[PDB]
Write a protein that holds these residues in place. Structure first.
Motif, PDB file in Angstrom:
ATOM      1  N   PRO A 142       0.813  -1.231   0.000  1.00 37.95           N
ATOM      2  CA  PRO A 142       0.000   0.000   0.000  1.00 37.95           C
ATOM      3  C   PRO A 142       0.837   1.267   0.000  1.00 37.95           C
ATOM      4  N   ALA A 143       2.002   1.244   0.651  1.00 41.83           N
ATOM      5  CA  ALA A 143       2.898   2.393   0.597  1.00 41.83           C
ATOM      6  C   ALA A 143       3.546   2.525  -0.776  1.00 41.83           C
ATOM      7  N   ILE A 144       3.958   1.402  -1.371  1.00 45.47           N
ATOM      8  CA  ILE A 144       4.638   1.442  -2.666  1.00 45.47           C
ATOM      9  C   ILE A 144       3.683   1.888  -3.766  1.00 45.47           C
ATOM     10  N   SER A 145       2.450   1.371  -3.750  1.00 39.11           N
ATOM     11  CA  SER A 145       1.510   1.640  -4.834  1.00 39.11           C
ATOM     12  C   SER A 145       1.135   3.116  -4.903  1.00 39.11           C
ATOM     13  N   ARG A 146       1.030   3.777  -3.747  1.00 39.89           N
ATOM     14  CA  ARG A 146       0.660   5.189  -3.738  1.00 39.89           C
ATOM     15  C   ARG A 146       1.710   6.044  -4.438  1.00 39.89           C
ATOM     16  N   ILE A 147       2.991   5.721  -4.246  1.00 41.43           N
ATOM     17  CA  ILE A 147       4.058   6.495  -4.878  1.00 41.43           C
ATOM     18  C   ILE A 147       4.004   6.356  -6.395  1.00 41.43           C
ATOM     19  N   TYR A 148       3.775   5.136  -6.887  1.00 41.29           N
ATOM     20  CA  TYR A 148       3.775   4.903  -8.330  1.00 41.29           C
ATOM     21  C   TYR A 148       2.634   5.642  -9.018  1.00 41.29           C
ATOM     22  N   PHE A 149       1.449   5.647  -8.410  1.00 40.21           N
ATOM     23  CA  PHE A 149       0.298   6.307  -9.012  1.00 40.21           C
ATOM     24  C   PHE A 149       0.233   7.796  -8.704  1.00 40.21           C
ATOM     25  N   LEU A 150       1.163   8.321  -7.910  1.00 37.45           N
ATOM     26  CA  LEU A 150       1.270   9.754  -7.682  1.00 37.45           C
ATOM     27  C   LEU A 150       2.233  10.429  -8.647  1.00 37.45           C
ATOM     28  N   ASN A 151       2.697   9.706  -9.667  1.00 36.01           N
ATOM     29  CA  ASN A 151       3.644  10.137 -10.700  1.00 36.01           C
ATOM     30  C   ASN A 151       5.040  10.357 -10.135  1.00 36.01           C
ATOM     31  N   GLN A 152       5.285   9.997  -8.878  1.00 38.69           N
ATOM     32  CA  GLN A 152       6.631   9.976  -8.331  1.00 38.69           C
ATOM     33  C   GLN A 152       7.319   8.674  -8.730  1.00 38.69           C
ATOM     34  N   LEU A 153       8.468   8.408  -8.102  1.00 44.64           N
ATOM     35  CA  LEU A 153       9.218   7.163  -8.284  1.00 44.64           C
ATOM     36  C   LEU A 153       9.639   6.973  -9.743  1.00 44.64           C
ATOM     37  N   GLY A 154       9.936   8.080 -10.422  1.00 46.63           N
ATOM     38  CA  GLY A 154      10.466   8.022 -11.777  1.00 46.63           C
ATOM     39  C   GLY A 154       9.554   7.282 -12.731  1.00 46.63           C
ATOM     40  N   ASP A 155      10.145   6.387 -13.518  1.00 45.80           N
ATOM     41  CA  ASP A 155       9.414   5.509 -14.422  1.00 45.80           C
ATOM     42  C   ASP A 155       9.815   4.072 -14.126  1.00 45.80           C
ATOM     43  N   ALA A 200       8.371   1.494 -15.869  1.00 49.82           N
ATOM     44  CA  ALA A 200       8.084   0.744 -17.095  1.00 49.82           C
ATOM     45  C   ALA A 200       7.181  -0.457 -16.820  1.00 49.82           C
ATOM     46  N   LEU A 201       6.200  -0.267 -15.941  1.00 50.22           N
ATOM     47  CA  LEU A 201       5.275  -1.341 -15.613  1.00 50.22           C
ATOM     48  C   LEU A 201       4.295  -1.573 -16.756  1.00 50.22           C
ATOM     49  N   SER A 202       4.017  -2.844 -17.032  1.00 49.62           N
ATOM     50  CA  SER A 202       3.061  -3.204 -18.065  1.00 49.62           C
ATOM     51  C   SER A 202       1.634  -3.015 -17.556  1.00 49.62           C
ATOM     52  N   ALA A 203       0.678  -3.116 -18.483  1.00 49.75           N
ATOM     53  CA  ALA A 203      -0.727  -2.936 -18.128  1.00 49.75           C
ATOM     54  C   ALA A 203      -1.196  -4.005 -17.148  1.00 49.75           C
ATOM     55  N   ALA A 204      -0.800  -5.259 -17.374  1.00 44.68           N
ATOM     56  CA  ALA A 204      -1.138  -6.321 -16.430  1.00 44.68           C
ATOM     57  C   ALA A 204      -0.436  -6.113 -15.095  1.00 44.68           C
ATOM     58  N   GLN A 205       0.820  -5.661 -15.131  1.00 44.61           N
ATOM     59  CA  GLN A 205       1.555  -5.412 -13.895  1.00 44.61           C
ATOM     60  C   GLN A 205       0.976  -4.229 -13.130  1.00 44.61           C
ATOM     61  N   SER A 206       0.605  -3.159 -13.839  1.00 47.42           N
ATOM     62  CA  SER A 206       0.038  -1.988 -13.177  1.00 47.42           C
ATOM     63  C   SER A 206      -1.299  -2.314 -12.524  1.00 47.42           C
ATOM     64  N   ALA A 207      -2.131  -3.111 -13.199  1.00 46.78           N
ATOM     65  CA  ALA A 207      -3.387  -3.552 -12.601  1.00 46.78           C
ATOM     66  C   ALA A 207      -3.139  -4.444 -11.391  1.00 46.78           C
ATOM     67  N   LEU A 208      -2.083  -5.260 -11.439  1.00 49.11           N
ATOM     68  CA  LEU A 208      -1.714  -6.079 -10.288  1.00 49.11           C
ATOM     69  C   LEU A 208      -1.340  -5.217  -9.087  1.00 49.11           C
ATOM     70  N   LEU A 209      -0.614  -4.121  -9.320  1.00 51.11           N
ATOM     71  CA  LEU A 209      -0.260  -3.223  -8.224  1.00 51.11           C
ATOM     72  C   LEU A 209      -1.483  -2.480  -7.698  1.00 51.11           C
ATOM     73  N   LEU A 210      -2.388  -2.081  -8.596  1.00 52.59           N
ATOM     74  CA  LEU A 210      -3.564  -1.318  -8.185  1.00 52.59           C
ATOM     75  C   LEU A 210      -4.487  -2.148  -7.302  1.00 52.59           C
ATOM     76  N   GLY A 211      -4.706  -3.414  -7.666  1.00 54.24           N
ATOM     77  CA  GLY A 211      -5.618  -4.247  -6.899  1.00 54.24           C
ATOM     78  C   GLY A 211      -5.115  -4.539  -5.498  1.00 54.24           C
ATOM     79  N   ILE A 212      -3.832  -4.878  -5.375  1.00 52.62           N
ATOM     80  CA  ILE A 212      -3.282  -5.231  -4.070  1.00 52.62           C
ATOM     81  C   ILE A 212      -2.943  -3.977  -3.273  1.00 52.62           C
ATOM     82  N   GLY A 213      -2.281  -3.013  -3.915  1.00 58.45           N
ATOM     83  CA  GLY A 213      -1.810  -1.843  -3.191  1.00 58.45           C
ATOM     84  C   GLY A 213      -2.932  -0.941  -2.713  1.00 58.45           C
ATOM     85  N   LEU A 214      -3.934  -0.715  -3.560  1.00 59.20           N
ATOM     86  CA  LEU A 214      -4.968   0.272  -3.275  1.00 59.20           C
ATOM     87  C   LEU A 214      -6.324  -0.339  -2.953  1.00 59.20           C
TER      88      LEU A 214
END
Lengths: 229, 311, 42, 144, 128
Positions: free
Chosen positions: D74-87, D89-103
């Motif tokens: 939950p801490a990691i996912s917020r940074i990625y979707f806040l446009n921080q943490l650089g880039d 290069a997460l894929s669409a399936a990977q980004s959805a995987l982070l969204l479901g678990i993290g948020l």
């Protein structure tokens, strides 16, 4: 129909009752029979809860004659029979005048008649609040090292009988004293606390500290909740 | 001292005895609150949902104490200084009887329907209630008896004496199970739980007693010499409430740390705590009855739920 | 005996069946006797 | 303002939303968003303790039990979707995987049904995700 | 370390825990740990934006609907249960309410059954 009704937790039994007809069966003083405290707790609940309650007991074996010598020999060997946990001695001061004692494991498991009775007292108390009694733990308590036994007794009078009545028993197993190089290898690839704590916190230093774990704490079923614990 | 106790617009209208309030009590359901007072001795019942008095019934003599036998307001027993015991049904006055000697306090045993009278005699009177006949007496062997209490957990009866000794009796078989020794007489006696007991003294000491050990677990001393009338127990915060005329002291059961203290304008005849709430009800030597709310102690009662919003 | 000074055991008609015996005791009868024997220093 | 509100409210009643649905709400092509500043040493240290950063690093080699780093997500996912943490290069399936678990705080098995991809492959996907994350954590660490 | 782990893990499998049970785990020894400094100005600006802090004080006056500040509650609940923010002298019911909403992500109606207080009262406790 609920088979092994005593084994499952009591709050789950309460929901299963409902407004319909219910058949249940429970096990006593058997290989997997439940302890006296839990079985009495369940049967008390049934009486408390136009319900018509029925009680039936089964006392004759299906494979051999009743009174079998081998069956009696096996039961007391593994201490598989729950009896009265102990005779109720005069009530004692709870936080004030009770002293712990160190039981010798070597003289307890020798087969003198005085020693055997104390073991039957202790094992009946040991598995009283236990969902399924395992004869393995009797073997583990017998011969595995570091599994120390401690019991608190009422203050002894100048005159006494052969065997004192036991109120509470606690089992302590010693762990720790593991080398740091050993703990690093396990993380990349001797009780629950040294390994789990080291794994969760990634602390190699912990583990070289020496300590014991309270494996079990048991109080006499009539006396549960008074302050022996 | 950071407790910020508030004082009370009108939660219940006409919560006002004409001159003074002797005793304040609450029902088991919490629906009804009962109060008695001088002059023209009255019994006034206040409905919590309606925020008003249900009825008012005048009486011949002042009532020392009363007990709510029924779960609701239907059945009430009054003890009078004229040795009179008055029974009230839901309609009103039902029957009145006398007791041979004056009665200090009484307690009722819900099992067996036996009600015990402690008063100005060595013997403690027993009145069976399923059959009207008076039962066999029990002799306490003490010149004067002050207070009595019955344990709910296991049914143990103890009576206070003027000599300062608590004597424990058994409602079954009517035999003396034990006796306890501890110049001042016993002002207040209270049972809490299976194993904890409290003794009040006119000098102003609260002594906590364990049934098994003669020595007291803890002693709390009121600096004033006034006797403590009522001792109450609050389970959630383990707070023991000891009240005297000058002040009310609330302190922890273990180690005797003091929670807070409330001093009112006038002396307290009685105090009462609404179950599972921070609301406190007091009876004073004033036509008004004091109402106090402690947010820290507990939440507001359901019928006064908006009080939390008002704060 | 005057003015009810001496206790009398005639049956009371109005008090008959005024309440019903209701008991909620957690302690079993065997536990009570063991506790009563051990009360205080006894 | 709405985008940051949506991330916090995914726990409250927006968890029932499918991860693909919530992803489109977060990212809109019409409003291109410049990348937010990457983590400084002050920000990364405040967010994660050294023993926390250690646990993520060792698990990347191990990839054994999955339950040590669950609190991090939950801490990691917020940074990625806040446009921080650089880039990352997460894929669409990977980004959805982070969204479901993290948020949305969904388990792997429940998210497996939504994603519809096999669970073992999702476990491989997440190990790829955290490997990118822990690598970038060290680069910020090495930069100072 | 465990205390901070438990707060984050309340939202995955420990939400089924009753709020009173989870509260008992957090607070132990009948005492407080080493007192951290009160919440710093720099930490406040990082956690909450000026528009965000604008919302909270406006809600404290208007008081009309709590859906506006729902996004703040997970952020606020972490600070209080980390022994930061000093002590707010919250009651037992108020503290359990904060844990239920901020960390276990339970709605007010769901918490009403757990706390056993009426939903109108729980709003007033949340208001304070």
């Amino acid at each position: 129909v609920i088979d092994e009704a005593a084994a499952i937790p009591l709050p789950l039994v309460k929901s299963l009752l409902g407004p319909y007809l219910v058949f249940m069966a429970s096990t006593i003083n058997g290989y997997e029979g439940t302890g006296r405290s839990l079985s009495l707790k369940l049967i008390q609940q049934l009486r408390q809860q136009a319900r018509t309650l029925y009680e039936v007991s089964l006392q004759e074996s299906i494979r051999y004659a009743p009174g079998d010598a081998v069956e009696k020999w096996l039961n007391d060997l593994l201490c598989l029979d729950c009896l009265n946990i102990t005779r109720i001695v005069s009530g004692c001061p709870l936080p004030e005048a009770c002293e712990l004692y160190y039981v010798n494991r070597d003289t307890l498991f020798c087969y003198h008649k005085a020693s055997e009775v104390f073991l039957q007292r202790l094992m009946a108390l040991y598995v009283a609040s236990h969902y399924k009694n395992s004869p393995n733990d009797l073997q583990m308590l017998s011969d595995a090292p570091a599994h120390h036994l401690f019991c608190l007794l009422p203050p002894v009078p100048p005159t006494q009988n052969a065997l004192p009545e036991v109120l509470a028993v606690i089992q302590v197993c010693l762990e720790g004293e593991i080398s740091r190089q050993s703990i690093l290898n396990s993380l990349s690839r001797g009780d629950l606390i040294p390994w789990t704590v080291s794994e969760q916190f990634q602390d190699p230093d912990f583990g070289g500290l020496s300590g014991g774990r309270v494996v079990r704490i048991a109080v006499h079923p009539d006396y549960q909740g008074m302050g022996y614990g | 001292n950071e407790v910020k106790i508030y004082s009370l617009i009108e939660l219940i209208q006409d919560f006002e005895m004409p001159t003074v309030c002797t005793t304040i009590k609450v029902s088991k359901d919490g629906q009804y609150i009962l109060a008695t007072g001088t002059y023209k001795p009255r019994v006034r019942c206040y409905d919590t949902y309606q925020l008003s008095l249900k009825f008012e019934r005048c009486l011949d003599s002042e009532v020392v104490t009363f007990e709510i036998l029924s779960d609701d307001y239907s059945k009430i027993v009054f003890l009078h200084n004229d040795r009179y015991i008055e029974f009230h049904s839901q309609s009103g006055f039902y029957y009145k009887t006398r007791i041979p000697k004056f009665g200090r306090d009484f307690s009722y045993h819900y099992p067996s329907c036996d009600l015990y009278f402690v008063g100005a005699s060595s013997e403690v009177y027993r009145l069976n209630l399923e059959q009207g006949r008076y039962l066999n007496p029990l002799q306490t062997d003490a010149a004067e008896n002050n207070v009595c209490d019955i344990n709910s957990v296991h049914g143990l009866f103890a009576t206070g004496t003027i000599e300062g000794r608590v004597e424990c009796w058994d409602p079954r078989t009517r035999n003396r199970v034990g006796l306890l020794d501890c110049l001042p007489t016993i002002s207040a006696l209270k049972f809490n739980g299976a194993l904890t007991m409290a003794v009040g003294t006119t000098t102003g000491q609260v002594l906590l007693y364990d049934l098994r050990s003669d020595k007291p677990l803890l002693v709390k001393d009121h600096q004033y010499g006034l006797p403590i009338k009522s001792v109450h127990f609050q389970d959630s915060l383990d707070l023991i409430l000891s009240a005297d005329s000058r002040i009310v002291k609330m302190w922890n059961k273990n180690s005797g740390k003091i929670f807070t203290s409330l001093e009112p304008e006038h002396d307290l005849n009685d105090v009462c705590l609404y179950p599972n709430s921070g609301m406190l009800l007091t009876a004073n030597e004033t036509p008004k009855m004091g109402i106090y709310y402690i947010p820290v102690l507990g939440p507001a009662p359901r019928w006064c739920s908006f009080l939390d919003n008002l704060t | 005996a005057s003015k009810g000074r001496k206790l009398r055991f005639h049956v009371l008609s109005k008090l008959l069946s005024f309440m019903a015996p209701i008991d909620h005791t957690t302690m079993n009868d065997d536990a009570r006797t063991e506790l009563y024997r051990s009360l205080f220093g006894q | 303002d709405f985008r940051r509100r949506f991330l916090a409210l995914l726990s409250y009643q927006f968890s029932t939303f499918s991860p693909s649905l919530a992803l489109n709400i977060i990212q809109n092509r019409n409003m291109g968003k410049p990348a937010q500043p990457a983590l400084s040493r002050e920000e990364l240290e405040a967010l994660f303790l050294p023993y926390d950063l250690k646990r993520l690093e060792m698990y990347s080699r191990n990839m054994v039990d999955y339950h040590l780093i669950m609190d991090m997500i939950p801490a990691i996912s917020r940074i990625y979707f806040l446009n921080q943490l650089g880039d990352l290069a997460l894929s669409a399936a990977q980004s959805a995987l982070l969204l479901g678990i993290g948020l949305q705080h969904k388990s792997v098995d429940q998210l497996e049904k939504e994603i519809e991809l096999p669970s073992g492959q999702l476990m491989g996907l997440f190990n790829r995700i955290i490997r990118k994350v822990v690598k970038l954590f060290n680069e910020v660490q090495e930069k100072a």
